[PDB]
Every structure is written in structure tokens, then in C-alpha cells.
């Protein structure tokens, strides 16, 4: 496998954007390797990001810089992954909450699951995820929730 | 499970083999003034009456029913109480006295914990402790 | 009123007096952790 003329343009655009310098230099940080690939469309864990890091650095800013010559052999590798996820995994998953067959979810119980296990979201991102409107004591639903996530 | 620093007790406890050959099998708890309840051994049993010595070796004739059975050091200086097996008086008495002394005031005796007041501003209540403990596992 | 000091005669009596024995006889299985089952089910999901 190798990158097509359309794919090379996708990689070039995003990389050229990432070059943030008063005098430019054409490099990305190893930390920025995260959201780069994400904007490229590939959905990775931070585990997937660090896996392709030249330096055994973990999260920090100001370790290693990668050129496009280095970045492409990163991208070319990333494309191989198959397990990205569907909708119906998430439907099966989120149904487990149920107790009476309602597919309805209380707000507190819904915020807590986001925060606790995994790569995790913060208190702040939960405030963003739920800012209303006008349903008290105080329920969301699993169907409309997931479909909006996938919809973007 | 896995230990922490002094907030928990020394919960990375050992299993010192020395203690094992003792589980065989006729040792009991005798009443003392000094410590309270101590360790005695059944040497010879006169039916309803017994001849049980003590840590101090003094041989004494006793009446059956007083003899509380030994609850092995498999439950020495752990966090909770839960696992202490033979639940007669002295098995508990010894275990908490040495917990307080070992700097652990509060102790799990289930949900209804035991605390033996320290009376001293112990440096445990600092936001290092209160930074880690944020809906922790 | 002394810090760190303990007495045996007192504590002897007190552990016999706060129903600590019988108290451990039930509260040996008595769960000290207790949350909500809907959450724990939803939060564990795809482990299996």
C-alpha cells in the first residue's frame, strides 16, 4: 500500500497548517501527532499515537519534532487498522444501563460514565456535552444521543 | 491488594513461615492482667477440667468453657477486620490494640469502623490526600 | 488526656463494651462500599 494523489494532498494540507512558526520550518511536535491524525480522519487512541513515536516520551510538549518524511511513514502505517467501530456496538453497550426497558438515562449517571474509565473526559467536557435544554429530574435517551455523536 | 503510604496500614504484609508450624492445634486464650487476653496451650485435659499453661509457663487447672480458641495470625495488621475467623473476645481485643499503636487510628470493622482517638494533629488530612481522593477507585 | 499513650485495663473493658465482637461477627461480610448497579453495569459493558 502507498498514498494516492488525493491522499498526499490531504496529508500535505494538514501538515502545512501544523507548521506554526514566525519564520516557518516545516515540523510537527510528537504531542501534536495526536490531533493531526485525527483531523486526517483516522480515529486513534493516545496508545495508537505513542506507538508511532520515535521518542519514548509520553504526553509532554517539547520533546521531538518530526518532518513530513517522518510523518508519512507514520500515516502509511496507521491506515492498516480495521477495528474503528460502528453504531450497533454502542447500542448494545449503552442498553446495559436499563432496569425497566425504557432506554432513558438520568443526567448524573450519564456524566459519571464519561469521566471515569478510559482515556476519559473532564468535568469541563461534560458541561459541554450537556447544556440543556428544558428536561427536569432529568432524562436523556440512548438512540438520539449516539446518532448525534456519529453525525458530528 | 496493592499498598500505599501511611494512610493505609502496612497492607503489603508478609506471610512469615515461622508462624505456620503453630497451627497444630491446641492453643487457646487465657485471661491475664498485664495484656488482657494471651496465649495458652492445652497440655493435658482432665475431661471437664483442663491443665493449660500460658506464655509465662505457669501451669494451671481451668474449667473447659473459658477456653477461647486461637484465631491464627493470618489476620495480623490488615486494613479491615472481615477475615478474622474464630470470633471470640480476645481474637479482636489484641488485633485493635496493636492497630492504634501502629499509627492507624481508624480501622475497617466493616462499614461501622473503629477509631481509637489519637489526640494529635496528625499530618494525614492534607490536600495531597485530598487531591488523590477524587471519586477514586 | 495524653497523646499516643494507651492503657490495657481500660481498652480491655471498652472493646468488650462497644459491642465490637458481635459487631465484627455481622460486619465481616457487611459491605463498606455501596454505589449504583445501573452505573456499574453500563461502565463495565464491553469487558466481555
Q: Where are the beta strands (DSSP E) in chain A?
A: 28-29, 65-66, 104-106, 139-141
Whether residue C28 contacts residue B81, with contact meaning beta carbons closer than 8 Å, is answered with: yes
> Cell 506507538, residue?
A51
Q: Three-state DSSP class for B53?
A: coil
What residues does A106 pair with on adjacent strands?
A139
Are A3 and A71 in contact by the 8 Å Cβ rule? The answer is no
Quick check: A93 contacting C, CB < 8 Å? yes
Task: Identify the experimental approach.
Answer: cryo-EM
Q: Which residues of C touch A100 (CB under 8 A)?
A: none
Which residue in the set C4, C8, C29 is minimally distant from B35, CB to CB? C8
Query: In this structure, what C-alpha cell is assigned to residue C25?
Result: 461477627
DSSP conformational letter for B28? E
Q: Which three cell numbers stand for residue A91?
A: 447500542
Contact call for residues A56 and A71 (beta carbons, < 8 A): no
With the CA atoms of A122, A123, A126 and A130 taken in that order, what torsion angle do they form, in degrees rounded to the nearest 10? -170
Measure in Å the smallest separation between the Cα of A113 and chain C Cα atoms.
Answer: 6
Tell me which chains share at least 3 CB pairs under 8 Å with chain B: C
d(CA B127, CA B51): 56
CA distance A31 to B26: 66
Other C-beta atoms closer than 10 Å to the C-beta of B106 total 14
Query: Where do we find the cell 501511611?
Result: B6
Q: Do A116 and C43 touch (CB under 8 A)?
A: yes
- Which residues in chain B have Cβ-Cβ distances shorter than 8 Å to C28? 81-84, 87, 110
Spell C36-45 as b/e; 16+ CB within 10 A means b.
eebbeebbeb
The 3-class secondary structure across B65-91, one letter per residue, is HHCEECCCHHHCCCCCCCCCCCCCHHH
Asked if C24 lies within 8 A of B118 by C-beta distance, the reply is no
In angstroms, this model's resolution equals 20.0
Question: Can you give the three-state secondary structure of chain A, one letter per residue?
Answer: CCCCHHHHHHHHHHHHHHCCCCCCCCCEECCCHHHHHHHHCCCCCHHHHHHCCCCCCCCCCCCCEECHHHHHHHHHHHCCCCCCCCCHHHHHHHHHHCCCCCCEEEHHHHHHHHHCCCCCCCHHHHHHHCCCCCCCCCEEEHHHHHHHHHHC
Inter-residue contact B96 to C20 (CB < 8 Å):
yes
Amino acid at each position: 500500500i502507498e498514498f494516492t494523489p488525493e491522499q498526499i494532498e490531504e496529508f500535505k494540507e494538514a501538515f502545512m497548517l501544523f507548521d506554526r512558526t514566525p519564520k516557518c520550518e516545516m515540523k510537527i511536535t510528537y504531542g501534536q501527532c495526536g490531533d493531526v491524525l485525527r483531523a486526517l480522519g483516522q480515529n486513534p487512541t493516545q496508545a495508537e499515537v505513542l506507538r508511532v513515536l520515535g521518542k519514548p516520551r509520553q504526553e509532554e510538549l517539547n520533546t521531538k519534532m518530526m518532518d513530513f518524511e517522518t510523518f508519512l511513514p507514520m500515516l502509511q502505517h496507521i491506515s492498516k487498522n480495521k477495528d474503528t467501530g460502528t453504531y450497533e456496538d454502542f447500542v448494545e453497550g449503552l442498553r446495559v444501563f436499563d432496569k425497566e426497558g425504557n432506554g432513558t438515562v438520568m443526567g448524573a449517571e450519564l456524566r459519571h460514565v464519561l469521566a471515569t474509565l478510559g482515556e476519559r473526559l473532564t468535568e469541563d467536557e461534560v458541561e459541554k456535552l450537556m447544556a440543556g435544554q428544558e428536561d427536569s429530574n432529568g432524562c436523556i435517551n440512548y438512540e438520539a444521543f449516539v446518532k448525534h455523536i456519529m453525525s458530528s | 491488594g496493592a499498598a500505599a503510604p501511611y494512610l493505609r496500614k502496612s497492607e503489603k504484609e508478609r506471610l512469615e513461615a515461622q508462624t505456620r508450624p503453630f497451627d497444630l492445634k491446641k492453643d487457646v486464650f487465657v485471661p491475664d492482667d498485664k495484656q488482657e487476653f494471651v496465649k495458652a496451650k492445652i497440655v493435658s485435659r482432665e475431661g471437664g477440667k483442663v491443665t493449660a499453661e500460658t506464655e509465662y509457663g505457669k501451669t494451671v487447672t481451668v474449667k473447659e468453657d473459658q477456653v477461647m480458641q486461637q484465631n491464627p495470625p493470618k489476620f495480623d495488621k490488615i486494613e479491615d477486620m472481615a477475615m478474622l475467623t474464630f470470633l471470640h473476645e480476645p481474637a479482636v481485643l489484641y488485633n485493635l490494640k496493636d492497630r492504634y499503636g501502629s499509627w492507624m487510628i481508624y480501622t475497617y470493622s466493616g462499614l461501622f469502623c473503629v477509631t481509637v482517638n489519637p489526640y494529635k494533629w496528625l499530618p494525614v488530612y492534607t490536600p495531597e490526600v485530598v487531591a488523590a481522593y477524587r471519586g477514586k477507585k | 488526656k495524653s497523646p499516643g499513650v494507651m492503657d490495657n485495663p481500660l481498652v480491655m473493658h471498652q472493646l468488650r463494651c462497644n459491642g465490637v465482637l458481635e459487631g465484627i461477627r455481622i460486619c465481616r461480610k457487611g459491605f463498606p462500599n455501596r454505589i449504583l448497579y445501573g452505573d456499574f453495569r453500563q461502565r463495565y459493558r464491553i469487558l466481555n
